[PDB]
Chain length 231, copies 3
């Protein structure tokens, strides 16, 4: 395990996701409100899935070698397995907060699936120049998602409770900033142009992942917006 | 890319799915009705997914070699990845049109999953005679789906709005004819008996795919059946 | 096929799932009640999926070799493909019976996904001692599911119809006993410590699978709890 310099960040990531999972699990024990239960379920599952995939990367299972540029390049494929399930759960948290219509939710989840799926294909593609074609398609799917979060959701939040409108606005802003960093790190890291070494890349993704999951969850689950308006 | 004679049909397929995706995306921009949004979301996602998988076939990612009959046989596995997601979306379009009950929808999607999954296993099976066992099981799942579309849905459409009944009937008929061709092409093509060469097989699937997705979508999204009855 | 001593149990399993599938399919033909249709759909799909995966194991497709302990160890990976889809369907049968809230259903299905997914990783892991780390995480996800079935569902059933409360209690008890045997068989069988040989392991899983699917389904589909209260 320690044979890879990036192991320290995989281990820290595993620990922080594990701790985040346990914290949300305990916190949600005292919850009976049916609406709050939905948000706790979604939000606890996110770091639990990430915990398993960080562990698989730490132990070496979630790593494969991909030939491109005349080299055997270490590619952590387990990231995409994580993201396939956790990024639509994160979007679902946002969509339920603002009572999004079903068509909009399906558009978001579908675009998200395309985003992660094409990122996976790009990560595993052996023809170097083609990796960036997949990156571009994935990034276009991301831009669609960000567009919807701003010009379909923000003006939906404003007709809702003030506490859900303010909580949505904060989580929207956190999401757009954090999620936009992922394609940049991929592009300059070992999957793309290879300018930033894998150990630093792994650190960067770990900070983004913990912030986008445990950070996000801490903000959401401390808000009164997750509860039905009750006396 | 041009090293494979079937590349021209993969390229045309990619282009037509891409163009179809953009057309539906633009067309649905001016839509606020919650019901119509569902149909636009579902129907736009279908060629978008197909676009990505056609591209993966064009670039060579979605192709593998399978030993059977003492030969290395080129198998485009990306078709099944496409179909796994797009065929239940197509069925969902039909089921929502007639306000199908939840049990019926689950039966359809489940049978569809079995249909595509067993087709994939058959496509990748190395014992030649066993490929046709999987083809038979998949075809039985197809026949179940077609049965339900006729003797569970058609008489559901007739108690609904005339515009939804007439639109459903047309899309049902398009679906049954087009979908029934797929097992025949598989059986006589490079996956099955090998009587029709891969380049012609690829052409045939491209015509079926564009018709079943973009053709289907053009009929559906031009109907007033996708809108709630409103003043 | 007969080259593997466990083939007889794979063949019997295939037959019993096939027969169970046909029986439930015929039985549900005379059903119009929308609630009952849901239970028939879910419950018929379960042995149908299991039939396909038992067949893939019989024909040899669903088997791979995994190096650990200095040996090539036969691992039937198709079990996890089965279980990935059938165990959440089984939980859905239980959850719908007691009209579980959406948050609880998502927690169950999510924990179940983690349970099966980590079992799959453990089954395919090449470092022997690490296989048991994945077994432990999977078992913890199982224990969560069993906890919810007892201390979240049982007291939900009691405020419902007596026929649904009594049917739920029986199916809950069947589920907890049968499902708890699976991690034990894995641990002592060819995936784990290797004390029980593969042919006996295969027998054990076949008895558990038929009981947990066809047995379970026979109890559920003969109950009046699956019908809406109607005059
Ligand atoms: C009911 O609605 C609220 C339940 O949501 C909360 C439900 C949770 C989503 C349940 C899912 C967590 C499972 C219990 C997962 C089990 C293994 C976990 C990964 C635990 C890992 C952390 C520990 C090992 C440090
Ligand atoms: C509604 C939304 C969910 C829409 C989803 C959007 C989605 C369509 C976007 C594209 C997804 C698609 C790229 C998934 C591809 C998975 C694939 C990378 C798995 C690895 O297999 C690739 C090659 C080795 O590189 O296998 C070597 C050759 C092997 C023989 C491969 C044969 C097995 C195939 C992988 C079977 C395909 C199954 C499905 C792709 C399962 C989807 C997995 C998940 C990653 C989407
Ligand atoms: C809101 O409900 C309506 C939105 O549906 C319409 C929503 C669409 C389903 C959004 C999904 C499309 C994504 C934007 C996919 C991005 C890449 C596409 C494959 C674009 C490819 C076509 C172009 C490259 C020729
Ligand atoms: C409700 C509905 C959805 C019901 C669904 C119906 C469904 C049950 C029908 C059968 C689906 C099942 C056949 C999927 C099999 C996928 C498999 C072909 C992927 C390729 O792996 C096959 C061999 C190489 O040929 O791998 C070589 C050996 C490797 C070590 C394989 C180990 C990895 C396994 C593939 C893990 C299994 C994961 C699940 C099958 C994911 C499902 C993928 C999708 C195609 C259904
Ligand atoms: C409508 O709601 C009730 C339908 O549920 C019942 C619907 C069923 C879930 C339909 C799914 C079964 C498909 C017809 C599967 C076809 C192949 C089967 C595996 C048949 C195998 C058994 C036989 C070959 C012995
Ligand atoms: C809401 C709930 C559903 C939550 C779900 C919980 C879930 C997160 C729990 C963990 C699931 C995760 C372990 C699935 C891993 C599948 C993996 C074993 C498939 C086989 O690939 C493993 C190695 C060979 O051993 O591939 C060799 C290297 C290859 C290059 C691998 C590259 C292809 C990757 C497999 C692509 C990943 C796609 C997704 C994992 C699809 C999920 C399949 C299913 C088994 C969950
Ligand atoms: C918890 C993990 C999260 C929130 C991950 C988010 C990841 C993305 C938004 C990834 C986006 C990518 C692209 C837009 C193109 C390049 C490849 C990706 C997959 C890194
Ligand atoms: C957009 C793509 C569509 C509508 C594809 C439909 C495909 C089928 C109905 C495929 C059916 C098959 C069988 C019935 C058995 C042989 C294998 C298949 C998968 C080709
Ligand atoms: C129809 C099949 C059923 C009901 C299978 C149930 C399987 C399980 C509950 C498996 C549990 C496992 C663990 C808890 C850890 C070890 C690995 C598994 C996957 C066997
Ligand atoms: C969105 C953030 C992307 C920028 C990442 C900056 C990383 C700077 C680290 C120094 C680069 C290491 C190069 C020498 C090894
Ligand atoms: C459902 C349509 C299946 C029939 C396809 C007919 C294809 C005819 C093309 C000629 C066959 C090529 C054989 C000589 C290369
Ligand atoms: C939950 C049941 C697990 C116990 C399984 C008992 C199997 C006993 C069979 C005898 C073991 C075979 C060892 C000699 C080959
Ligand atoms: C490819 C995996 C996509 C599914 C991820 C799980 C999250 C799905 C959330 C469903 C949202 C509800 C839509 C109506
Ligand atoms: C194996 C992939 C199956 C899922 C495909 C996505 C479409 C699912 C549509 C869900 C229909 C709603 C059922 C209640
Ligand atoms: C990884 C596969 C998980 C999906 C299995 C299919 C069963 C899903 C049942 C959905 C229950 C409804 C939740 C709201
Ligand atoms: C186009 C929608 C406006 C809100 C999205 C902001 C786009 C940020 C760009 C992210 C950088 C990705 C490379
Ligand atoms: C049995 C249901 C009647 C409607 C379905 C028509 C079946 C068409 C056969 C398709 C050919 C597949 C090989
Ligand atoms: C902790 C919840 C109480 C009900 C679950 C009973 C646990 C049975 C243990 C199963 C054995 C697995 C190794
Ligand atoms: C070796 C790099 C070749 C450049 C490929 C860039 C493709 C980016 C596509 C953006 C439309
Ligand atoms: C080499 C071909 C052997 C014939 C197999 C046909 C099987 C079809 C099954 C239909 C019930
Ligand atoms: C396994 C193929 C089944 C096709 C005939 C339909 C059987 C009746 C089902 C009624 C829902
Ligand atoms: C070779 C076996 C080494 C023992 C591993 C047991 C790990 C079990 C983890 C339970 C917390
Ligand atoms: C509760 C702490 C969980 C941390 C387990 C994984 C950390 C890796 C240590 C090497
Ligand atoms: C908008 C046109 C999209 C076409 C891109 C793929 C066509 C392949 C050209 C070689
Ligand atoms: C209807 C009987 C189904 C049995 C088919 C599979 C049994 C395997 C026989 C070798
Ligand atoms: C993006 C950083 C999130 C910070 C989380 C802090 C949570 C405290 C309530
Ligand atoms: C099956 C062929 C479909 C033809 C689509 C034409 C759409 C025009 C409205
Ligand atoms: C766990 C054993 C189940 C027994 C099923 C018998 C069904 C008869 C109604
Ligand atoms: C990591 C366990 C958290 C302890 C409880 C925190 C207050 C709910
Ligand atoms: C008003 C919300 C500001 C949140 C910005 C957080 C940036 C990481
Ligand atoms: C809305 C601001 C987006 C900031 C992008 C930051 C990418 C590192
Ligand atoms: C391909 C872009 C379509 C242009 C608009 C067509 C009329 C909505
Ligand atoms: C009355 C609907 C006829 C549609 C037939 C289309 C055949 C491709
Ligand atoms: C309902 C008519 C089906 C026609 C099947 C055509 C197959 C090529
Ligand atoms: C296996 C076929 C079952 C025959 C009908 C049983 C009574 C519904
Ligand atoms: C009162 C229900 C008892 C069911 C026990 C079944 C054990 C297999
Ligand atoms: C509730 C009793 C569980 C029995 C476990 C049996 C495991 C073989």
């Amino acid at each position: 395990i320690t044979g890879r310099p990036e192991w320290i960040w995989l281990a820290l990531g595993t620990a922080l996701m594990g701790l985040g999972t346990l914290y949300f699990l305990v916190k949600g024990m005292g919850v009976s409100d049916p609406d709050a239960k939905k948000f706790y379920a979604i939000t606890t599952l996110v770091p639990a899935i990430a915990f398993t995939m960080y562990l698989s990367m730490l132990l070496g299972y979630g790593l494969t070698m991909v030939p491109f540029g005349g080299e055997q390049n270490p590619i952590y494929w387990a990231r995409y397995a994580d993201w396939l399930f956790t990024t639509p759960l994160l979007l679902l948290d946002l969509a339920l907060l603002v009572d999004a219509d079903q068509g909009t939710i399906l558009a978001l989840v579908g675009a998200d699936g395309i985003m992660i799926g094409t990122g996976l294909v790009g990560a595993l593609t052996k023809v170097y120049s083609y990796r960036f074609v997949w990156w571009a398609i994935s990034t276009a799917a991301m831009l669609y998602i960000l567009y919807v979060l701003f010009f379909g959701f923000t003006s939906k939040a404003e007709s809702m409770r003030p506490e859900v409108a303010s909580t949505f606005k904060v989580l929207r802003n956190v999401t757009v900033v954090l999620w936009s960093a992922y394609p940049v790190v991929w592009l300059i890291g070992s999957e793309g142009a290879g300018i930033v070494p894998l150990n630093i890349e792994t650190l960067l993704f770990m900070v983004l992942d913990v912030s986008a999951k445990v950070g996000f969850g801490l903000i959401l689950l401390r808000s009164r917006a997750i509860f039905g308006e009750a006396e």
